[PDB]
Amino acid sequence: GSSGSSGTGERPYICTVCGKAFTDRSNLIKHQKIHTGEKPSGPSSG
Ligand SMILES: [Zn+2]
């Protein structure tokens, strides 16, 4: 296998949509931009 991370330790904020973690709240909010904005105003139905 192959997994490289800062090491041990968890985060306070965690995207309750995909399953991602974030140290700073702001950072998290910026990430949601992917769940709130994925496709433009078109025939798409989410
Ligand atoms: Zn997410």
Curated annotation (Swiss-Prot):
| Record's subcellular location | Nucleus
Report the domain of life of the source organism.
Eukaryota
Zinc finger feature spans (C2H2-type): 13-35
Function as written in the Swiss-Prot or TrEMBL entry: May be involved in transcriptional regulation.
- Which family does this protein fall into? Belongs to the krueppel C2H2-type zinc-finger protein family.
Protein name per its UniProtKB record: Zinc finger protein 484
Annotated source species: Homo sapiens
Which part of the full protein is shown?
491 to 523 of 852
